Amino acid sequence: SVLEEARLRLHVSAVPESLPCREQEFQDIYNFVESKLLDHTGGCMYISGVPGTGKTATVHEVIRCLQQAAQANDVPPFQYIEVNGMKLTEPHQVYVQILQKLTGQKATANHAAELLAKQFTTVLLVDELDLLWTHKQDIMYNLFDWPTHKEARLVVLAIANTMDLPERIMLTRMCFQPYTYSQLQQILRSRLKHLKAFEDDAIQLVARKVAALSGDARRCLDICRRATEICEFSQGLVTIAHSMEAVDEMFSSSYITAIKNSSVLEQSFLRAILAEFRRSGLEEATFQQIYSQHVALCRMEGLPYPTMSETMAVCSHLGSCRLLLVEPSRNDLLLRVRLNVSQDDVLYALKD
Amino acid sequence: LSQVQRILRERFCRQSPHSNLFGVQVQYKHLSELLKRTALHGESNSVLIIGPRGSGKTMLINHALKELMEIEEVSENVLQVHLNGLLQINDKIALKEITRQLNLENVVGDKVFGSFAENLSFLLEACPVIFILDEFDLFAHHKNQTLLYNLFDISQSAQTPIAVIGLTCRLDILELLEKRVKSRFSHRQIHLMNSFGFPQYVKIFKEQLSLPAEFPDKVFAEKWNENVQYLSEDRSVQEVLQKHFNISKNLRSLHMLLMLALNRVTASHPFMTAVDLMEASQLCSMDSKANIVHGLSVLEICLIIAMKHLNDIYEEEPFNFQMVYNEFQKFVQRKAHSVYNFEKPVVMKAFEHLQQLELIKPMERTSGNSQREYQLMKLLLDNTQIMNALQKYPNCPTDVRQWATS
Amino acid sequence: TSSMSKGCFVFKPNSKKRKISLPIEDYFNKGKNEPEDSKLRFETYQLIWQQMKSENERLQEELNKNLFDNLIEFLQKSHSGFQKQIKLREIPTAALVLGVNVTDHDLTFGSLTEALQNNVTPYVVSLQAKDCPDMKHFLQKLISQLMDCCTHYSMDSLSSWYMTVTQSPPVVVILKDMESFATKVLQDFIIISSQHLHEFPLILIFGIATSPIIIHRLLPHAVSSLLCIELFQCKEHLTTVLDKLLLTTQFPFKINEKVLQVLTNIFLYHDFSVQNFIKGLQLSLLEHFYSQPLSVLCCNLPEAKRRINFLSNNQCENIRRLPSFRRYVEKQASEKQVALLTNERYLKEETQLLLENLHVYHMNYFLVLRCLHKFTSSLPKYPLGRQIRELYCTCLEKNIWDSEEYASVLQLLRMLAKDELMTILEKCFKVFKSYCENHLGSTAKRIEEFLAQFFEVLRENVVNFIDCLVREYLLPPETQPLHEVVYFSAAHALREHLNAAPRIALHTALNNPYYYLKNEALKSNIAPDICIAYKLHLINLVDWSEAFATVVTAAEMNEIIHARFIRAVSELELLGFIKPTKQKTDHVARLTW
Amino acid sequence: DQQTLRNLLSKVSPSFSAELKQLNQQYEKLFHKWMLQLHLGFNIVLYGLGSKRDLLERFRTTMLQDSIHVVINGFFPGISVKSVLNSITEEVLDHMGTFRSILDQLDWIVNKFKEDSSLELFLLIHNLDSQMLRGEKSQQIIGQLSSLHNIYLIASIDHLNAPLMWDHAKQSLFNWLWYETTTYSPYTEETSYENSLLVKQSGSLPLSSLTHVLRSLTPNARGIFRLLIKYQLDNQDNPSYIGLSFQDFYQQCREAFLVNSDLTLRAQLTEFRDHKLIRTKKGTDGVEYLLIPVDNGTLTDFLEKEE
Amino acid sequence: ENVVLCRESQVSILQSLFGERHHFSFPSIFIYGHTASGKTYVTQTLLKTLELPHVFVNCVECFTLRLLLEQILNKLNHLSSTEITCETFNDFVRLFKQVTTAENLKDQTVYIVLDKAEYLRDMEANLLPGFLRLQELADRNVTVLFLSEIVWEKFRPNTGCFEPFVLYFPDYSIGNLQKILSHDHPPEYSADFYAAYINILLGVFYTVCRDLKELRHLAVLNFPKYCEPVVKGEASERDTRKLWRNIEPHLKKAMQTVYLREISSSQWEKLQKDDYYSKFILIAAYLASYNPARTDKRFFLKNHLLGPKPFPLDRLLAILYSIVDSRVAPTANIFSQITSLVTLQLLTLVGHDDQLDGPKYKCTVSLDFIRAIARTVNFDIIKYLYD
Ligand SMILES: [Mg+2]
Ligand SMILES: [Mg+2]
Ligand SMILES: [Mg+2]
């Protein structure tokens, strides 16, 4: 049909061969690698940024176009090694993984460290540097200082989420920036070239909202494909109402509607909490005072007189679903109770 | 009869697939066509089903997988793996279960992989696969949440179609995730609040204990459905139904209430009665603490009245054994002249009996650092429970009540 | 050597290969009086202290085995309940309270292990609180010792071992340090073992160092109701060791009243310790053999009398100068003074007759005292004393009839029933039978017809019989001549060696330096710098600095009177008098006396 | 005044010189009597007003020449019982090695003296009431040393109320015999004059003054200073990367339930700086050090003995 | 052999909920009760009576998870008929699905009874939710029983669980206790005589004790005392007044001695078959600790609530010289004797600031212990503590 191809292009696994809006970073990283692969010298680079920036696809484009150059006899041929930091069980296994990738030998962690030491053309990539932290803090310090040698002839590209880690460790620094309005609009238009499946104002509203909150492309493609599903329900063209339903489906906090659908005694429990705060003025309170106000509230409403075990079941039911913040229940009648949500959200939920 | 007990005990306790779904039409509709996109096509999606305890999450997922499983082509080439948050508490327990339940344990054998992701990638390459994660919130309390990343990454990036469905009681589930696993997680939320009122709940009560139409003896089923039709409009049933609806809107409490009602039907009493449901509701709503206070001795009650007067005069300040004993001595020496003039270590043993049952707690628990006396304790009862349980005591003397009022 | 910036400088005799050391007798002797006398007396000292040490070790061994016997019999009674289906039986425990000290508890429990291993069980084990923090370690070590006496081990795994080897004896667990165990481990071990006791019998030995209330504090009533407790346990040890050391005629040396009055007043006042009573006697027997050269005679009579025959003239002169002998010779007849002092051969031969007169006074004294103990303990009021050590002090101090104490003792003993006297004389006859070689064999006969008589006239005789016995035989030992060769009375020297007092001594030197600096320094100002700072104190530092200056100059530019004041404050602070405070520059008076 | 100025000012002379002179030979007479009692299983500790250092020094010249004897300076600020047992094991005994615990060292020494009586050791202690040897564990080790027959001991006490350390069980170990030696020799060697009224202070703080200034303190402040000690100790293994950081210190202290606000930590650092405990090197281009200059082995000894 | 008395409604409810073998029952029933109301007895006799294949496992025995799971697995394996080892809850459930498919166990309700279940909530966090949902996880018609002393509201973890039907066993009344005790009767006398003894024993011990086990143990020990008037001949079976007059003082004395377990039962049955300065230091420390410092000069020279108050040693020696009417020298031994009492735990040093110049001691001893020592040396503590 029409929207089936829209879902095929909008799915995130269909990465384009050329990503729009990050051409200067591709050129910068390409010239950085080209200046050191040609002369057989080594260095190091640190990249970071929020997870919605597009670092993996861009570095894959850089690596790919270097194999395209290397097959054309432009640059000296190089072996590619890759490790991802998140995907390993214990942090020492990066050494033995590079050892398996480079030569046929397999060993333990410290023996891999020693053979890496005695051995040190290749281009290493280390994504997700954050989990190689130890209290000994040896691993990343190795990962920077091995290429700074004559025998190394290798380059290391490090990727993370916070630019304030290389200092604590005690290097060229690049920064992937959060996305704006126009770049997100251009990439949504670039994935939708030869298809008349959307009117442009839906793209406008979704791009403006995701640039308002976070600025990630994964949110963009998820909201737009969910709106494509919403268009599949209402049977075309995806109007503004479908995207407006999608965004307050997947971005709104459902705490107030969780309050509103509950039973009478749970809302009376929250009334007892707010009435006790208005009598006191603090932000935490014992179960005894909430129970004391709740007996008076149940007397005034006309509900039958509640026992401590029944209201305790009520309080445990709220505490399981994190609408309150409560201690483990092994002590009783002296649970200090505090809200997780603001007071005005609760007062808006109970007025209707 | 035997068969009505068999079918209704299959309905309530071992919660069984029954075709009726209540007020979840939009949610079941969306989840069902989404599973058909993942089933017939190569689309890969991720949803957490979010709702409180006992609101029908396992029912929804089992009904949807069964109704999907009826279709032949998805029946041939879909393998299911069910994981619960209570069994697998480590990334290794989880890995072992996923390699076992796909029946590639002979395929793996002695092979050693570099990484967790290499293991899962070698596993899945030997066809759509559906993953179901009961109790998703305890996978957010591991060391690194490596399982959650290695599920969402292969869902979102890998060509192998993966469906990941989550079940969770914590409403703040997008606040315990790390930022990166949040970034690859599509925020598709399906909310099963108990979105129904009291007449709908009366219809639930009517429908849930009505025999099916595949029962062999038809006339007994007709008379039984007419009987529960009659009990649906009875006001005595609706008063306890209104009370237990006021406590909660969960249907598992209704299942327990109906099971405690069904327990009292025999061949001697062939049809249910309103007083049966009244007895079941009285059995469910007993209060524990006053019941424990009912089973105490007279000296125990005198200690608790003395400790109540300590918490009324010395207002939220802790206490030890000796102040309690001097208050009790003040009761015996003037009011109960010569009555209950017990010695010191018997009152000590009665105090230790109270501690044993955990009605009195230490504010600071330091075992052996100080002796038994001069150690600060707090009362774990309300005054109104003490008055209520004292009014229901089997043989309570006049003077202990006269002290209890004054 | 000793002043450099480290705290361990050790001299070794290197570069001189002469490792021959100094003799111990060369360190003991120091004078030119008699050397060979001083090297035979200390072989005598060594032999007597070997006899003392052997006598003490045996005394204690008897008392120890006596206690273990009471434990063995109890262990056979409670297993009879297992011999006769758990019927909710309890676990027997025995509370074996030892002494205050912990160092000898290794030897006490070592003797208990071999006592139980022969009599009750072939399986007995001991457990330690150091190596049992939790139940998993506690149950790990317990199966390791039972298996040697013959993997997540359990109490169920314990009982399967019991049917492996028995296919009847109990197993005994010795908790030697019950106070040191954790509270959680002891509560859990009782409950797990009580449910499986009918196929695994249990008997527990607890080591209670403190008062036995410590069972209740660690173990609550909910857990201690599953156990049946029995208690198993100074003054009785003291009167035992006095009678088999001092009162025996077996051993030659004695001690005086004031040596004894020191050694009893340290025991029953401060600490009920029999071991420092031995510490007193090893000093008291020491200073006798060193100070007096004629201590070589203090032996058994065959060895003593041969030593008189071979003596130096100086040592014979020392016998001539014995103050007991000077009063012997003055009352002696007019021909006999010139016989002894001029002739060393007459002087020697007089001694063996005097030494044997002295030695038979050792045998006639105590058998009267043991007999007099039997009348006095049978008396109800206990006037002179209730124990053998209280009669011995009050008789040796002065003649007891010379005091008015014995007059009331005779008055009470005169009026008694016949069966009481028949009870006493049965005891009094077997005391005579207990000790042979009697030189009061005549009085051994006389009480036997007094026994054979069994009314007002006849019971007056036997009361007068013991009354005439105490006049004839019991006398203070100073009356007999040549007593000092076997006696030692250095009272205040013995007092100064043990219970000395520093807080008198530091207070003494500061207030009155005229005691120890006899150069007319004080009669009721001319004082050293340490003392001046003390008396003026009995307080800000600058007023104390000024008033120190007017005193030291009244006895006399000056800057040293503040420099003297700096040392007099600083040494007074190393001592526990002054501690700096924040109200003034300083304000402290913690001596307060 | 200065401490070095007071050591240089040594021109004073004793007034009663001849009167105090006769109080050396009088107590020199009792040397052989002391030798006779000690050799047979006793111990002697001397109680008096002035310093007994010169009397025991005269005792070691006149009597203890042809013997294997060791002298302990308890008045030395760096003294410990582990030091004296290691000294005996390495110098008196010919063993060369390291031992797991000092209780096993006490057991090894006792076991060695059971098998052989040919060794005799004269154990000389100039002061036993000094701050470092006051603990009941230390004198428990000493009492288990003292009870044997091949070990002979001499000691002194100075404090007004000295025997609050040894009890009935401990004086069963120590076979005390007591003697009056109340000379008026001044405590020239034993008064180190540190932390006195004299304002002059020399070098880093020794162990005793460090414990004395840190025990009269808030326990949260003690925890803060122990955090500083362990952090400087884990940095001082190598001369590079030494240096704490105020912001890192605030992060580490606020990670615990120790401090609420940064101004309270500023008050803490000024409270340490008034006693010259912290050395503030903040503002340095490399790192804002904020380290402590106390000797690191003394710091390990303080942290291991703080409770 | 086994009879249960005054448990008729609860037994009927249990057998109604258990139903037939092929029926499906609850996943969890939780039972709370008092310290002895036949929580173990009723369910264990009732699972022996109907022949339901069941495993009875104590939790206090199983202080680790591995012991608990291997114990339940081996007991159910013996019910089927080498050794079964599982380390995790996952392998427990997998091998439980492996083992229960035997021919006897296919279509009946398997029971796992866990008594003393209050030691599970300290074990791990994931174990109690693991057993509360066992029917849904394993799918093999399995019912789980919980026996405890603590109410269910103290058992809930933070994240909520499958709620059981909570079940209550009532306390025994005086009539029910009388009827239980008068069943296992002594054959050599009449039952009415033994019932009169149970009646007078409940007339003595009901006010303090409602517990079954202690009351039966007291009846067992004090029965040989009761039957001596009829053996000797002064009384007979019908003279109830003489028996009560003879026996009341014995049981009134037995509460202070036997019930507190000061004197053990063996010595009680054997008795019925057989018919210096440390004293003053411990006065000085207790007068220092329990007395304010501002009143020190009035009592010596011329509360018991809230615990002790620490005192200095300078005050301690100042007290000690004022009571003892003699010249007492501050020797080696008297300072050596104070530090013996701290080794006996009668006194305690507080603060640990310094050793010799730390005066801070604390007096951990009761009032009555001092009053016995003071009577020995004939001294009045009452005049000196307070007015
Ligand atoms: Mg990435
Ligand atoms: Mg579920
Ligand atoms: Mg039980």
Query: Residue D175 and residue D147: Cα distance in Å, rounded?
Result: 7
Q: One-letter amino acid identity for B401?
A: R
Q: Do E333 and C135 touch (CB under 8 A)?
A: no
Question: Which residue precedes each gap in chain D (C to N above 2.5 Å)?
Answer: none
Q: Do B294 and E150 touch (CB under 8 A)?
A: no
Going from the C-alpha of B290 to that of each of B296, C205, C213, the distances in angstroms are 10, 43, 36
HEC string of C564-581?
Answer: HHHHHHHHHHHCCCCCCC
Specify whether the CB–CB gap between E34 and E212 falls below 8 A.
Answer: no
| Mutation target vs E (from D161, D208, D211; most E CBs, 10 A cutoff) | D161
- The phi-psi region of residue D243 (left if phi > 0; otherwise alpha if psi is between -120 and 50; otherwise beta) is left
Three-state SS for A194?
coil
Tell how far the Cα of E129 is from the centroid of ligand 2, in angstroms.
12
Going from the C-alpha of D253 to that of each of A133, C254, D257, D283, the distances in angstroms are 21, 73, 8, 21
- C524 and C460 assigned to the same domain: no
Bridge partner list, A44: A156
Q: Is the dihedral of CA E95, E97, E98, E101 positive or negative?
A: positive
**Which chain C residues contact residue D193 at CB under 8 A?**
570
Helix-strand-coil split of chain D, %, nearest 5: 45, 10, 45
The answer, yes or no, to whether D and C have at least 3 beta-carbon pairs within 8 Å is yes
Query: Residue E367 and residue E363: Cα distance in Å, rounded?
Result: 11
Q: One-letter amino acid identity for B142?
A: H
Longest dimension (CA), chain A: 88
- How large is the C-alpha radius of gyration of chain D? 24
The label of the residue with tokens 């002169």 reads: C317
Smallest CA-to-CA distance from D53 within D130, D119, D165, D108 is with D130
Q: One-letter amino acid identity for E360?
A: K
Q: Is the dihedral of CA A279, A284, A286, A290 positive or negative?
A: positive
Query: Residue B334 and residue D260: Cα distance in Å, rounded?
Result: 52
Range of the domain at D41: 3-180
Query: Residue A326 and residue A332: Cα distance in Å, rounded?
Result: 11
Q: Which chains touch D (3 or more CB pairs under 8 A)?
A: C, E
Three-state SS for C143?
helix
Specify whether the CB–CB gap between A271 and A236 falls below 8 A.
Answer: no
Query: Residue C100 and residue C119: Cα distance in Å, rounded?
Result: 28
- D113 and D247 assigned to the same domain: no
Q: Is the dihedral of CA E232, E236, E241, E244 positive or negative?
A: positive
Query: Residue D52 and residue D181: Cα distance in Å, rounded?
Result: 8
B135 φ/ψ angles, rounded to the nearest 5 degrees: 55, 65
A5 is in an annotated binding site: no
Q: Is E159 on the interface with A (CB under 8 A)?
A: yes
Q: What angle do CA B343, C208, C123 make, to 5 degrees?
A: 120
Query: Residue B124 and residue B107: Cα distance in Å, rounded?
Result: 12
Q: Where is the domain boundary, C425, C454, C473?
A: C473
- The phi-psi region of residue A302 (left if phi > 0; otherwise alpha if psi is between -120 and 50; otherwise beta) is left
- D173 and D214 assigned to the same domain: no
Bridge partner list, B162: B129
- How large is the C-alpha radius of gyration of chain A? 28
**A23-175 belongs to CATH 1.20.120.450:** no
Q: Is the dihedral of CA C577, C579, C585, C588 positive or negative?
A: negative
One-character DSSP codes across E192-239: HHHHHHHHHHHHHHTTT---HHHHHHHHHHHHHHHTHHHHHTS--TT-
Tell how far the Cα of E2 is from the centroid of ligand 3, in angstroms.
16
Q: One-letter amino acid identity for D96?
A: M
Q: Do D168 and E337 touch (CB under 8 A)?
A: yes
Q: List, as ranges, residues with CB under 5 A of the ion ligand 2.
A: B 58, 134
Q: Do E332 and C225 touch (CB under 8 A)?
A: no
Three-state SS for B130?
strand
Smallest CA-to-CA distance from E331 within B133, C34, B341, D178 is with D178
Domain with CATH 3.40.50.300 in chain A: 23-175
Specify whether the CB–CB gap between E96 and E138 falls below 8 A.
Answer: yes
Segment holding D182, helix H or strand E:
none
DSSP H helical ranges for E303-343: 313-323, 332-341
Query: Residue B83 and residue B129: Cα distance in Å, rounded?
Result: 14
- C86 and C200 assigned to the same domain: yes
Smallest CA-to-CA distance from A332 within A279, A291, A303 is with A291
Cα A122–chain centre separation: 30
Q: What is the CATH number of the domain that holds B165?
A: 3.40.50.300
Going from the C-alpha of C375 to that of each of C362, C481, E39, the distances in angstroms are 21, 30, 67
Query: Residue C251 and residue C241: Cα distance in Å, rounded?
Result: 13
Query: Residue E300 and residue E320: Cα distance in Å, rounded?
Result: 10
Bridge partner list, A240: none
Q: One-letter amino acid identity for A126?
A: V
Domain with CATH 1.10.8.60 in chain A: 3-12+180-250
HEC string of C225-268?
Answer: CCEEEEEECCHHHHHHHHHCCCCCCCCCCCCCHHHHHHHHHCCC
DSSP H helical ranges for C135-231: 135-149, 155-165, 183-194, 214-218, 221-224
Query: Residue D259 and residue D221: Cα distance in Å, rounded?
Result: 9
Q: One-letter amino acid identity for B20?
A: N
Three-state SS for E71?
helix
- The phi-psi region of residue D283 (left if phi > 0; otherwise alpha if psi is between -120 and 50; otherwise beta) is left
What tokens were used for B193?
């609040």
Specify whether the CB–CB gap between C541 and C515 falls below 8 A.
Answer: no
To one decimal, the resolution in angstroms is: 4.0
Query: Residue C190 and residue E76: Cα distance in Å, rounded?
Result: 27
A192 φ/ψ angles, rounded to the nearest 5 degrees: -125, 45
Cα C331–chain centre separation: 41
Contacts of D4 (CB under 8 A, 6+ apart): D200, D202
| Mutation target vs E (from C195, C267, C499; most E CBs, 10 A cutoff) | C499
Bridge partner list, C126: C174
- D141 and D29 assigned to the same domain: yes
Starting at the earlier edge strand, list the strands of the sheet with B46-50.
Answer: B79-84, B129-134, B162-168, B46-50, B188-191
Contacts of E214 (CB under 8 A, 6+ apart): C225, E259
Strands E165-168 and E142-148, bridge-based pairing: unpaired
Contacts of C228 (CB under 8 A, 6+ apart): C78, C90, C91, C92, C93, E264, E265, E266
Q: One-letter amino acid identity for E265?
A: S
Query: Residue C121 and residue C141: Cα distance in Å, rounded?
Result: 19
Longest dimension (CA), chain D: 70
Query: Residue C459 and residue B41: Cα distance in Å, rounded?
Result: 129
Residue C216 lies in a domain: yes
Strands D176-180 and D43-47, bridge-based pairing: parallel
Specify whether the CB–CB gap between B349 and B368 falls below 8 A.
Answer: no
Tell how far the Cα of A127 is from the centroid of ligand 1, in angstroms.
7
Residue C246: burial class (beta carbons within 10 Å; 0-12, 13-18, 19+): middle
Specify whether the CB–CB gap between B17 and B61 falls below 8 A.
Answer: no
Contacts of E368 (CB under 8 A, 6+ apart): none
Query: Residue E160 and residue E181: Cα distance in Å, rounded?
Result: 43
Q: Do E25 and B15 touch (CB under 8 A)?
A: no
DSSP category for residue A304: P
Bridge partner list, C227: C91
C383 φ/ψ angles, rounded to the nearest 5 degrees: -70, -55
- C321 and C217 assigned to the same domain: no
Q: From the options 3.40.1210.10, 1.10.1740.10, 3.40.50.300, 1.10.10.10, give the CATH code of A257-351.
A: 1.10.10.10
Range of the domain at B132: 2-191
CB B148: neighbour CB atoms within 10 A? Answer: 21
What tokens were used for C172?
């005994």
Specify whether the CB–CB gap between A162 and B178 falls below 8 A.
Answer: no
Smallest CA-to-CA distance from C565 within B12, D1, E361 is with D1
Strands B360-362 and B377-379, bridge-based pairing: antiparallel
Number of domains forming the structure of chain D: 2
What tokens were used for D250?
């605030």
Specify whether the CB–CB gap between C91 and C194 falls below 8 A.
Answer: yes
Number of domains forming the structure of chain C: 3
HEC string of C194-210?
Answer: HCCCCCCCCEEEEEECC
D277 φ/ψ angles, rounded to the nearest 5 degrees: -95, -45
Q: One-letter amino acid identity for D289?
A: Y
Strands B162-168 and B129-134, bridge-based pairing: parallel
Three-state SS for D183?
coil
Bridge partner list, E58: E115
Q: One-letter amino acid identity for C302?
A: P
Strand segments (E) across C35-165: 91-97, 124-127
Q: Do E337 and D165 touch (CB under 8 A)?
A: no
The label of the residue with tokens 């207030």 reads: C511
Smallest CA-to-CA distance from D180 within D146, D153, D156, D152 is with D156
Q: What angle do CA C273, C279, C282 make, to 5 degrees?
A: 150
Contacts of E107 (CB under 8 A, 6+ apart): E21, E22, E141
**Which chain C residues contact residue E67 at CB under 8 A?**
152, 154
Taking only residues 361 to 390 of chain B, the set having a beta carbon closer than 8 angstroms to any beta carbon of chain C reads 367-368, 371-372
The label of the residue with tokens 């009085």 reads: C443
Contacts of D141 (CB under 8 A, 6+ apart): D81, D85, D102, D103, D106
- How large is the C-alpha radius of gyration of chain C? 34
Strands E54-58 and E28-32, bridge-based pairing: unpaired
Range of the domain at C404: 293-473
One-character DSSP codes across B58-73: HHHHHHHHHHHHTSHH
Specify whether the CB–CB gap between B115 and A89 falls below 8 A.
Answer: yes
Query: Residue D22 and residue D33: Cα distance in Å, rounded?
Result: 19
Contacts of A89 (CB under 8 A, 6+ apart): B91, B115, B116, B146
CB C214: neighbour CB atoms within 10 A? Answer: 16
The answer, yes or no, to whether B and D have at least 3 beta-carbon pairs within 8 Å is no
Going from the C-alpha of C283 to that of each of B285, C29, D27, D181, the distances in angstroms are 84, 17, 20, 20
Going from the C-alpha of A152 to that of each of A45, A75, A121, D98, E138, the distances in angstroms are 15, 18, 8, 44, 57
Starting at the earlier edge strand, list the strands of the sheet with D68-72.
Answer: D68-72, D121-125, D151-157, D43-47, D176-180
- D101 and D167 assigned to the same domain: yes
One-character DSSP codes across E6-58: S--HHHHHHHHHH--SSS---SEEEEE--SSSSHHHHHHHHHHHTT--EEEEE
Q: Is the dihedral of CA D181, D185, D190, D194 positive or negative?
A: positive
Smallest CA-to-CA distance from B91 within B165, B14, B149 is with B149
Contacts of A111 (CB under 8 A, 6+ apart): none
Experimentally, how was this structure solved? cryo-EM
What tokens were used for C340?
């002894």
One-character DSSP codes across C265-281: HTTTTT---SHHHHHHH
- How large is the C-alpha radius of gyration of chain E? 31
DSSP category for residue A305: P
**Helices first, then strands: H and E counts in chain E:** 18, 7
Q: Is the dihedral of CA B168, B172, B176, B181 positive or negative?
A: positive
Query: Residue A80 and residue B298: Cα distance in Å, rounded?
Result: 83
Specify whether the CB–CB gap between B272 and B22 falls below 8 A.
Answer: no
- D17 and D117 assigned to the same domain: yes
Q: Where is the domain boundary, C426, C458, C473?
A: C473
Q: What is the CATH number of the domain that holds C72?
A: 3.40.50
Q: What is the CATH number of the domain that holds D48?
A: 3.40.50.300
Q: Do E154 and A326 touch (CB under 8 A)?
A: no
A252 φ/ψ angles, rounded to the nearest 5 degrees: -75, 145
Cα C306–chain centre separation: 35
Query: Residue D35 and residue C23: Cα distance in Å, rounded?
Result: 12
- C74 and C215 assigned to the same domain: yes
CA atoms within 13 A on the CB side of C359: 17
Contacts of B134 (CB under 8 A, 6+ apart): B58, B82, B83, B84, B85, B167
Q: From the options 3.10.20.30, 3.40.50.170, 1.10.8.60, 2.40.50.100, give the CATH code of A3-12+180-250.
A: 1.10.8.60
Segment holding B152, helix H or strand E:
helix B146-156
Q: Is the dihedral of CA A286, A287, A290, A296 positive or negative?
A: negative
- C229 and C137 assigned to the same domain: yes
Going from the C-alpha of C577 to that of each of C130, C299, D129, E312, E354, the distances in angstroms are 41, 53, 15, 15, 15
Query: Residue A162 and residue A168: Cα distance in Å, rounded?
Result: 12
Bridge partner list, E147: E31
Query: Residue A345 and residue E19: Cα distance in Å, rounded?
Result: 50
DSSP category for residue E366: -
